[PDB]
Amino acid sequence: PPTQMRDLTASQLLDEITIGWNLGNTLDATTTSWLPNPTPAQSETAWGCPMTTKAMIDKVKEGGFNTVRVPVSWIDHTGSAPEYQIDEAWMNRVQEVVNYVIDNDMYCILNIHHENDWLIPTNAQKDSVNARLDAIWTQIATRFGSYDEHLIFEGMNQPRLVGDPNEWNGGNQEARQVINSYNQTFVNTVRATGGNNAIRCLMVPTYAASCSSTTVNDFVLPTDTVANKLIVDIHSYSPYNFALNTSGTSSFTQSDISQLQWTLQEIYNSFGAKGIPVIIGQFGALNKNNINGRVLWGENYLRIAKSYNIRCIWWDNNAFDTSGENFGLLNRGTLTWQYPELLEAMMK
Ligand SMILES: OC[C@H]1O[C@@H](O[C@H]2[C@H](O)[C@@H](O)[C@H](O[C@H]3[C@H](O)[C@@H](O)[C@@H](O)O[C@@H]3CO)O[C@@H]2CO)[C@H](O)[C@@H](O)[C@@H]1O
Numbered sequence: 001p002p003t004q005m006r007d008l009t010a011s012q013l014l015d016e017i018t019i020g021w022n023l024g025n026t027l028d029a030t031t032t033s034w035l036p037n038p039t040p041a042q043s044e045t046a047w048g049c050p051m052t053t054k055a056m057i058d059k060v061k062e063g064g065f066n067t068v069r070v071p072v073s074w075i076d077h078t079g080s081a082p083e084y085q086i087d088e089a090w091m092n093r094v095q096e097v098v099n100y101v102i103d104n105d106m107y108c109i110l111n112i113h114h115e116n117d118w119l120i121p122t123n124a125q126k127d128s129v130n131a132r133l134d135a136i137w138t139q140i141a142t143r144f145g146s147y148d149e150h151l152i153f154e155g156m157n158q159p160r161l162v163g164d165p166n167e168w169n170g171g172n173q174e175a176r177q178v179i180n181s182y183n184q185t186f187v188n189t190v191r192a193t194g195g196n197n198a199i200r201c202l203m204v205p206t207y208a209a210s211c212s213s214t215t216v217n218d219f220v221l222p223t224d225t226v227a228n229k230l231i232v233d234i235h236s237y238s239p240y241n242f243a244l245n246t247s248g249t250s251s252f253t254q255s256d257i258s259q260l261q262w263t264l265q266e267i268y269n270s271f272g273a274k275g276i277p278v279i280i281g282q283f284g285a286l287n288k289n290n291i292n293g294r295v296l297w298g299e300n301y302l303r304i305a306k307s308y309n310i311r312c313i314w315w316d317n318n319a320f321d322t323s324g325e326n327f328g329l330l331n332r333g334t335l336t337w338q339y340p341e342l343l344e345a346m347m348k
Pocket of ligand 1: 024046048315
Protein backbone atom coordinates (compact mmCIF):
# COMPACT_ATOMS: atom_id res chain seq x y z
CA PRO A 1 0.00 0.00 0.00
CA PRO A 2 1.07 3.63 -0.44
CA THR A 3 3.23 5.22 2.24
CA GLN A 4 1.48 8.29 3.60
CA MET A 5 2.84 11.24 1.66
CA ARG A 6 3.11 14.95 2.29
CA ASP A 7 1.98 17.08 -0.66
CA LEU A 8 4.78 19.64 -0.87
CA THR A 9 5.96 21.87 -3.66
CA ALA A 10 9.40 21.42 -5.20
CA SER A 11 10.62 24.56 -3.44
CA GLN A 12 9.37 23.25 -0.10
CA LEU A 13 11.08 19.89 -0.63
CA LEU A 14 14.35 21.55 -1.64
CA ASP A 15 14.20 23.61 1.58
CA GLU A 16 14.26 20.35 3.56
CA ILE A 17 17.41 19.15 1.77
CA THR A 18 20.65 20.21 3.47
CA ILE A 19 23.47 18.80 1.30
CA GLY A 20 23.56 15.62 -0.79
CA TRP A 21 25.93 12.81 -1.80
CA ASN A 22 26.03 10.69 -4.96
CA LEU A 23 26.67 6.93 -4.85
CA GLY A 24 28.89 7.31 -7.88
CA ASN A 25 30.47 4.68 -10.15
CA THR A 26 28.24 2.02 -8.55
CA LEU A 27 24.78 1.14 -9.96
CA ASP A 28 25.71 3.52 -12.82
CA ALA A 29 28.69 1.39 -13.90
CA THR A 30 28.35 -0.02 -17.41
CA THR A 31 29.98 -3.07 -19.03
CA THR A 32 28.28 -2.75 -22.41
CA SER A 33 31.43 -2.94 -24.54
CA TRP A 34 32.76 -6.25 -23.15
CA LEU A 35 30.07 -7.96 -21.03
CA PRO A 36 26.54 -7.72 -22.45
CA ASN A 37 24.65 -9.55 -19.66
CA PRO A 38 26.25 -8.68 -16.31
CA THR A 39 24.81 -9.91 -13.06
CA PRO A 40 23.88 -7.19 -10.54
CA ALA A 41 27.09 -7.88 -8.63
CA GLN A 42 29.25 -7.73 -11.77
CA SER A 43 27.79 -4.31 -12.60
CA GLU A 44 27.89 -2.77 -9.13
CA THR A 45 31.57 -3.71 -8.61
CA ALA A 46 32.75 -3.05 -12.17
CA TRP A 47 34.25 0.40 -11.54
CA GLY A 48 36.22 0.16 -8.30
CA CYS A 49 33.45 0.17 -5.72
CA PRO A 50 32.55 -2.57 -3.24
CA MET A 51 29.03 -3.85 -2.80
CA THR A 52 27.08 -1.02 -1.18
CA THR A 53 25.97 -1.57 2.41
CA LYS A 54 23.59 0.17 4.79
CA ALA A 55 26.61 0.99 6.97
CA MET A 56 28.05 3.13 4.18
CA ILE A 57 24.84 5.15 3.88
CA ASP A 58 24.66 5.43 7.68
CA LYS A 59 28.14 7.00 7.53
CA VAL A 60 27.09 9.43 4.79
CA LYS A 61 24.23 10.61 7.03
CA GLU A 62 26.54 10.84 10.07
CA GLY A 63 28.86 13.07 8.07
CA GLY A 64 26.09 15.64 7.58
CA PHE A 65 24.35 14.70 4.31
CA ASN A 66 20.57 14.23 4.35
CA THR A 67 20.11 13.30 0.65
CA VAL A 68 21.59 10.55 -1.52
CA ARG A 69 21.43 10.55 -5.30
CA VAL A 70 21.50 6.95 -6.58
CA PRO A 71 22.61 7.05 -10.24
CA VAL A 72 21.51 3.89 -12.01
CA SER A 73 22.47 2.68 -15.47
CA TRP A 74 19.74 0.35 -16.72
CA ILE A 75 21.06 -0.37 -20.23
CA ASP A 76 22.94 -3.57 -19.36
CA HIS A 77 19.85 -4.84 -17.47
CA THR A 78 17.19 -4.03 -20.10
CA GLY A 79 15.73 -6.58 -22.50
CA SER A 80 14.89 -6.25 -26.16
CA ALA A 81 12.25 -4.05 -27.74
CA PRO A 82 9.35 -3.46 -27.55
CA GLU A 83 8.99 -4.54 -23.91
CA TYR A 84 12.44 -3.41 -22.73
CA GLN A 85 11.94 -5.61 -19.68
CA ILE A 86 14.24 -4.73 -16.79
CA ASP A 87 15.97 -7.71 -15.18
CA GLU A 88 14.12 -8.55 -11.97
CA ALA A 89 17.33 -9.23 -10.01
CA TRP A 90 18.61 -5.77 -10.95
CA MET A 91 15.37 -4.03 -10.01
CA ASN A 92 15.49 -5.84 -6.65
CA ARG A 93 19.04 -4.66 -5.97
CA VAL A 94 18.20 -1.07 -6.93
CA GLN A 95 15.32 -1.18 -4.46
CA GLU A 96 17.62 -2.56 -1.74
CA VAL A 97 20.01 0.38 -2.20
CA VAL A 98 17.21 2.95 -2.38
CA ASN A 99 15.91 1.50 0.89
CA TYR A 100 19.29 2.03 2.59
CA VAL A 101 18.63 5.75 1.97
CA ILE A 102 14.87 5.90 2.49
CA ASP A 103 15.01 3.86 5.70
CA ASN A 104 17.57 6.34 7.06
CA ASP A 105 14.92 9.10 6.84
CA MET A 106 16.88 10.69 4.00
CA TYR A 107 15.87 12.12 0.64
CA CYS A 108 16.71 9.93 -2.33
CA ILE A 109 17.01 10.75 -6.04
CA LEU A 110 16.73 7.80 -8.44
CA ASN A 111 17.58 8.32 -12.13
CA ILE A 112 18.56 6.70 -15.39
CA HIS A 113 22.25 7.42 -15.92
CA HIS A 114 24.65 6.17 -18.62
CA GLU A 115 21.97 5.40 -21.23
CA ASN A 116 23.57 7.36 -24.07
CA ASP A 117 24.13 4.30 -26.28
CA TRP A 118 20.38 4.46 -27.01
CA LEU A 119 19.30 7.84 -25.50
CA ILE A 120 20.23 9.72 -28.66
CA PRO A 121 18.80 13.27 -29.12
CA THR A 122 18.12 13.37 -32.86
CA ASN A 123 14.92 13.53 -34.88
CA ALA A 124 15.84 10.20 -36.46
CA GLN A 125 15.92 8.45 -33.05
CA LYS A 126 13.20 10.48 -31.31
CA ASP A 127 10.22 8.13 -31.70
CA SER A 128 12.24 5.03 -30.75
CA VAL A 129 13.80 6.76 -27.75
CA ASN A 130 10.48 8.13 -26.49
CA ALA A 131 9.02 4.61 -26.68
CA ARG A 132 11.94 3.12 -24.72
CA LEU A 133 11.86 5.93 -22.15
CA ASP A 134 8.17 5.29 -21.57
CA ALA A 135 8.70 1.53 -21.33
CA ILE A 136 11.47 1.76 -18.74
CA TRP A 137 10.00 4.67 -16.72
CA THR A 138 6.66 2.84 -16.41
CA GLN A 139 8.56 -0.08 -14.84
CA ILE A 140 10.64 2.09 -12.50
CA ALA A 141 7.72 4.28 -11.47
CA THR A 142 5.45 1.33 -10.69
CA ARG A 143 8.09 -0.46 -8.62
CA PHE A 144 8.73 2.71 -6.57
CA GLY A 145 5.24 4.19 -6.65
CA SER A 146 4.43 3.54 -2.98
CA TYR A 147 7.31 5.66 -1.64
CA ASP A 148 6.58 9.01 0.02
CA GLU A 149 7.90 12.50 -0.81
CA HIS A 150 11.43 11.54 0.19
CA LEU A 151 11.86 9.72 -3.14
CA ILE A 152 12.41 11.89 -6.23
CA PHE A 153 12.64 10.54 -9.77
CA GLU A 154 15.14 12.14 -12.21
CA GLY A 155 14.24 11.32 -15.80
CA MET A 156 17.67 11.47 -17.48
CA ASN A 157 21.25 12.36 -16.56
CA GLN A 158 23.28 14.12 -19.28
CA PRO A 159 21.46 13.65 -22.60
CA ARG A 160 23.78 14.85 -25.33
CA LEU A 161 25.28 14.25 -28.77
CA VAL A 162 28.07 11.80 -28.02
CA GLY A 163 31.04 12.31 -30.33
CA ASP A 164 29.77 15.59 -31.76
CA PRO A 165 32.37 18.39 -31.88
CA ASN A 166 30.03 20.25 -29.51
CA GLU A 167 29.02 17.25 -27.39
CA TRP A 168 29.92 19.20 -24.22
CA ASN A 169 29.16 22.65 -25.64
CA GLY A 170 25.41 22.56 -26.19
CA GLY A 171 25.14 20.09 -29.06
CA ASN A 172 22.92 21.49 -31.80
CA GLN A 173 19.47 23.03 -31.95
CA GLU A 174 17.90 19.73 -32.99
CA ALA A 175 19.34 17.91 -29.97
CA ARG A 176 18.13 20.58 -27.54
CA GLN A 177 14.65 20.40 -29.06
CA VAL A 178 14.47 16.60 -28.91
CA ILE A 179 15.56 16.59 -25.24
CA ASN A 180 12.49 18.69 -24.40
CA SER A 181 10.37 15.89 -25.89
CA TYR A 182 12.20 13.26 -23.83
CA ASN A 183 11.68 15.20 -20.58
CA GLN A 184 7.99 15.66 -21.45
CA THR A 185 7.60 11.92 -22.07
CA PHE A 186 9.23 11.13 -18.72
CA VAL A 187 6.84 13.39 -16.83
CA ASN A 188 3.78 12.03 -18.64
CA THR A 189 4.91 8.44 -18.05
CA VAL A 190 5.27 8.92 -14.30
CA ARG A 191 2.00 10.82 -13.84
CA ALA A 192 0.12 8.07 -15.72
CA THR A 193 0.77 5.70 -12.79
CA GLY A 194 -1.18 7.83 -10.30
CA GLY A 195 -1.07 7.29 -6.57
CA ASN A 196 1.87 8.92 -4.84
CA ASN A 197 3.48 9.33 -8.27
CA ALA A 198 0.75 11.86 -9.10
CA ILE A 199 2.33 14.33 -6.65
CA ARG A 200 5.96 13.19 -6.51
CA CYS A 201 8.60 15.80 -7.27
CA LEU A 202 10.54 15.05 -10.47
CA MET A 203 13.90 16.26 -11.76
CA VAL A 204 14.84 16.93 -15.40
CA PRO A 205 18.15 18.02 -16.95
CA THR A 206 18.97 20.52 -19.63
CA TYR A 207 21.18 19.41 -22.52
CA ALA A 208 24.18 17.66 -20.85
CA ALA A 209 22.81 19.00 -17.53
CA SER A 210 24.70 22.16 -18.49
CA CYS A 211 23.79 25.75 -17.71
CA SER A 212 24.77 28.06 -20.56
CA SER A 213 22.85 30.61 -22.63
CA THR A 214 22.55 28.05 -25.42
CA THR A 215 21.10 25.24 -23.31
CA VAL A 216 18.89 27.48 -21.15
CA ASN A 217 17.34 29.49 -23.99
CA ASP A 218 16.23 26.32 -25.81
CA PHE A 219 15.04 24.48 -22.67
CA VAL A 220 11.29 24.03 -22.09
CA LEU A 221 10.10 22.81 -18.69
CA PRO A 222 7.60 19.96 -19.27
CA THR A 223 3.90 20.63 -18.89
CA ASP A 224 2.72 18.86 -15.74
CA THR A 225 -0.61 17.58 -14.43
CA VAL A 226 0.05 19.18 -11.02
CA ALA A 227 1.58 22.50 -10.06
CA ASN A 228 5.08 23.18 -8.76
CA LYS A 229 6.55 19.66 -8.74
CA LEU A 230 9.43 19.93 -11.25
CA ILE A 231 13.11 20.65 -10.58
CA VAL A 232 15.92 21.27 -13.06
CA ASP A 233 19.20 19.43 -12.48
CA ILE A 234 22.41 21.25 -13.41
CA HIS A 235 25.81 19.61 -12.95
CA SER A 236 28.44 22.27 -12.24
CA TYR A 237 32.03 21.11 -11.78
CA SER A 238 33.24 24.68 -11.60
CA PRO A 239 35.70 26.13 -12.29
CA TYR A 240 36.33 23.46 -14.94
CA ASN A 241 40.13 23.49 -15.08
CA PHE A 242 40.48 23.16 -11.30
CA ALA A 243 37.53 20.91 -10.55
CA LEU A 244 37.10 18.51 -13.48
CA ASN A 245 40.10 18.75 -15.87
CA THR A 246 42.55 16.04 -14.86
CA SER A 247 45.25 18.05 -16.70
CA GLY A 248 44.18 21.42 -15.30
CA THR A 249 45.51 23.58 -12.51
CA SER A 250 45.49 22.41 -8.91
CA SER A 251 45.35 25.99 -7.57
CA PHE A 252 42.20 27.74 -6.35
CA THR A 253 42.67 31.10 -4.66
CA GLN A 254 40.78 34.15 -3.39
CA SER A 255 41.01 35.47 -6.94
CA ASP A 256 38.87 32.58 -8.25
CA ILE A 257 35.92 33.21 -5.94
CA SER A 258 34.51 35.87 -8.28
CA GLN A 259 34.31 33.49 -11.25
CA LEU A 260 32.56 30.94 -9.03
CA GLN A 261 30.09 33.58 -7.89
CA TRP A 262 29.34 34.38 -11.53
CA THR A 263 28.85 30.73 -12.48
CA LEU A 264 26.49 29.99 -9.59
CA GLN A 265 24.62 33.27 -10.08
CA GLU A 266 23.98 32.20 -13.68
CA ILE A 267 22.22 29.04 -12.46
CA TYR A 268 20.13 31.16 -10.10
CA ASN A 269 19.30 33.73 -12.77
CA SER A 270 18.42 31.09 -15.38
CA PHE A 271 16.06 29.08 -13.15
CA GLY A 272 15.47 29.94 -9.48
CA ALA A 273 15.01 33.66 -10.15
CA LYS A 274 12.37 32.81 -12.79
CA GLY A 275 10.43 30.54 -10.46
CA ILE A 276 11.91 27.33 -11.86
CA PRO A 277 13.38 25.28 -8.99
CA VAL A 278 16.94 24.10 -9.60
CA ILE A 279 19.41 21.80 -7.86
CA ILE A 280 23.11 21.13 -8.48
CA GLY A 281 22.77 17.36 -8.70
CA GLN A 282 26.50 16.84 -9.18
CA PHE A 283 29.53 18.94 -8.27
CA GLY A 284 33.02 18.10 -7.02
CA ALA A 285 36.70 18.90 -7.38
CA LEU A 286 39.25 16.24 -8.30
CA ASN A 287 41.89 15.25 -5.78
CA LYS A 288 45.10 16.89 -7.04
CA ASN A 289 46.94 16.61 -3.71
CA ASN A 290 45.85 20.18 -3.11
CA ILE A 291 43.88 20.16 0.12
CA ASN A 292 44.21 23.87 0.96
CA GLY A 293 42.85 24.85 -2.46
CA ARG A 294 40.01 22.36 -2.34
CA VAL A 295 39.08 23.54 1.18
CA LEU A 296 38.94 27.16 0.03
CA TRP A 297 37.00 26.18 -3.10
CA GLY A 298 34.60 23.99 -1.14
CA GLU A 299 33.80 26.51 1.58
CA ASN A 300 33.01 29.15 -1.03
CA TYR A 301 31.08 26.83 -3.37
CA LEU A 302 28.60 25.84 -0.64
CA ARG A 303 28.42 29.37 0.82
CA ILE A 304 27.63 30.92 -2.56
CA ALA A 305 25.22 28.15 -3.57
CA LYS A 306 23.31 28.53 -0.29
CA SER A 307 23.21 32.31 -0.79
CA TYR A 308 21.24 31.64 -4.01
CA ASN A 309 19.12 28.94 -2.30
CA ILE A 310 20.64 26.18 -4.48
CA ARG A 311 21.17 22.76 -2.91
CA CYS A 312 24.31 20.83 -3.90
CA ILE A 313 25.09 17.10 -4.24
CA TRP A 314 28.72 15.92 -4.15
CA TRP A 315 29.81 13.35 -6.77
CA ASP A 316 31.58 10.56 -4.81
CA ASN A 317 33.10 7.86 -7.01
CA ASN A 318 35.18 6.27 -4.22
CA ALA A 319 38.45 7.01 -6.09
CA PHE A 320 41.38 8.71 -4.31
CA ASP A 321 44.77 8.14 -5.95
CA THR A 322 43.88 6.39 -9.22
CA SER A 323 44.98 7.38 -12.73
CA GLY A 324 41.37 8.41 -13.44
CA GLU A 325 39.00 10.94 -11.91
CA ASN A 326 39.49 10.97 -8.13
CA PHE A 327 36.27 12.33 -6.67
CA GLY A 328 36.24 10.13 -3.57
CA LEU A 329 35.21 11.60 -0.23
CA LEU A 330 34.06 8.55 1.74
CA ASN A 331 36.49 5.64 1.60
CA ARG A 332 33.81 2.97 1.48
CA GLY A 333 36.03 0.01 2.38
CA THR A 334 37.48 1.61 5.52
CA LEU A 335 34.38 3.72 6.37
CA THR A 336 36.55 6.81 6.76
CA TRP A 337 36.28 10.35 5.45
CA GLN A 338 39.53 10.61 3.50
CA TYR A 339 39.49 14.43 3.31
CA PRO A 340 38.10 15.59 6.67
CA GLU A 341 39.07 19.26 6.19
CA LEU A 342 37.16 19.34 2.91
CA LEU A 343 34.11 17.67 4.47
CA GLU A 344 34.20 20.24 7.29
CA ALA A 345 34.46 23.06 4.74
CA MET A 346 31.30 21.94 2.94
CA MET A 347 29.35 21.28 6.16
CA LYS A 348 29.80 24.64 7.90
O1 LIG B 1 37.65 4.15 -13.01
C1 LIG B 1 36.49 3.39 -13.10
C2 LIG B 1 35.75 3.76 -14.37
O2 LIG B 1 35.60 5.22 -14.40
C3 LIG B 1 34.87 5.70 -15.64
O3 LIG B 1 34.86 7.08 -15.64
C4 LIG B 1 33.78 7.64 -14.80
C5 LIG B 1 34.35 8.62 -13.81
O4 LIG B 1 35.17 7.90 -12.82
C6 LIG B 1 33.29 9.38 -13.08
O5 LIG B 1 33.89 10.37 -12.20
C7 LIG B 1 32.35 10.08 -14.05
O6 LIG B 1 31.32 10.65 -13.37
C8 LIG B 1 30.63 11.57 -14.23
C9 LIG B 1 29.14 11.41 -14.03
O7 LIG B 1 28.74 10.02 -14.35
C10 LIG B 1 28.40 12.28 -14.94
O8 LIG B 1 26.97 12.33 -14.62
C11 LIG B 1 28.84 13.72 -15.13
O9 LIG B 1 28.28 14.66 -14.31
O10 LIG B 1 30.35 13.88 -14.95
C12 LIG B 1 30.95 13.01 -13.90
C13 LIG B 1 32.43 13.33 -13.83
O11 LIG B 1 33.04 13.15 -15.03
O12 LIG B 1 31.80 9.07 -14.99
C14 LIG B 1 32.84 8.33 -15.76
C15 LIG B 1 32.09 7.42 -16.69
O13 LIG B 1 31.39 8.20 -17.67
C16 LIG B 1 35.59 5.21 -16.89
O14 LIG B 1 34.81 5.60 -18.02
C17 LIG B 1 35.80 3.74 -16.88
O15 LIG B 1 36.62 3.38 -18.02
C18 LIG B 1 36.50 3.27 -15.61
O16 LIG B 1 36.54 1.85 -15.59
